[PDB]
């Protein structure tokens, strides 16, 4: 049915978390009327909650830090669903600090997952996909659930600008 069944839980969760961390967050939900199979509605909640929490906690910076960096004091967190053909696309986008791709590469080298010699030409997708590696509620589990639903997940991010996580599910 409508994804609002999941999305309606989130405003109070988001607001509670932002408050606790001295963040002002404009949380915008779009496409809440988007319908898809009830299995997906029943299961996508916990993964989305992790992404929202990540954005508030790790993404959106404290107001003082936003001001210091010359960003709007209020951060923006957008949760959207839409139809794209026979798939539904769910996006979680924030205008926070972004994911530090350099830090990912440094850790992958440290963990012996890649050699330094390969770092210079790694694609952005290949870098950000290390986030799904176990040990790198967890981001690994987010991907495992999405893929159990025959979905896919990708991440785009730019330092200091923010992060967008995209989930594609079938309508099934
Ligand atoms: N939206 C956003 N913005 C900045 C981030 C910066 C780092 C990031 O990973 C580290 C935190 C993490 C914990 C447990 C499982 C997965 C990831 C995630 C981030 N996400």
Your description of this structure?
It comes from Thermotoga maritima (strain ATCC 43589 / DSM 3109 / JCM 10099 / NBRC 100826 / MSB8). It is found in: Cytoplasm. Residues 1-172 form the Histidine kinase domain. Involved in the transmission of sensory signals from the chemoreceptors to the flagellar motors. CheA is autophosphorylated; it can transfer its phosphate group to either CheB or CheY. This is Chemotaxis protein CheA. The protein has a single domain (1-172), classed as Histidine kinase-like ATPase, C-terminal domain (Heat Shock Protein 90), CATH 3.30.565. The protein has 172 residues and is an alpha+beta fold. The longest helix has 15 residues, at 45-59. The protein has helices at residues 4-7, 10-20, 38-43, 45-59, 63-68, 101-110, 124-128, 139-148; strands spanning 25-30, 75-84, 87-94, 152-158, 162-170. The chain has a five-stranded mixed sheet. It starts with a helix and ends with a strand. It is globular, with a radius of gyration of 17 Å. α2 packs parallel to α4 (45-59). 39% of the residues lie in helices and 23% in strands. Bound molecules: 7-(2-phenylethoxy)quinazolin-2-amine. 7-(2-phenylethoxy)quinazolin-2-amine binds next to α4.
């Amino acid at each position: 049915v409508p994804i609002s069944f999941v999305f309606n839980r989130f405003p109070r969760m988001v607001r509670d978390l932002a408050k606790k961390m001295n963040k002002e967050v404009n949380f915008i939900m779009r496409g809440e009327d988007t319908e898809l199979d009830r299995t997906f509605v029943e299961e996508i909640g916990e993964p989305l909650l992790h992404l929202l929490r990540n954005a508030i906690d790790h993404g959106i910076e404290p107001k003082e830090e936003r001001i210091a960096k010359g960003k709007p004091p209020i951060g923006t967190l957008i949760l959207s669903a839409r139809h794209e053909g026979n798939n539904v696309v769910i996006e979680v986008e924030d205008d926070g600090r972004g994911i530090d791709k350099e830090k990912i590469i440094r850790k992958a080298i440290e963990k012996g997952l890649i050699d330094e010699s390969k770092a210079a030409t790694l694609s952005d997708q290949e870098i950000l996909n290390f986030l799904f590696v176990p040990g790198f509620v967890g981001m690994d589990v987010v991907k495992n659930v999405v893929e159990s639903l025959n979905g896919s997940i990708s991440i785009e991010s730019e330092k200091d600008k923010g992060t967008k996580v995209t989930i594609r599910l079938p309508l099934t």
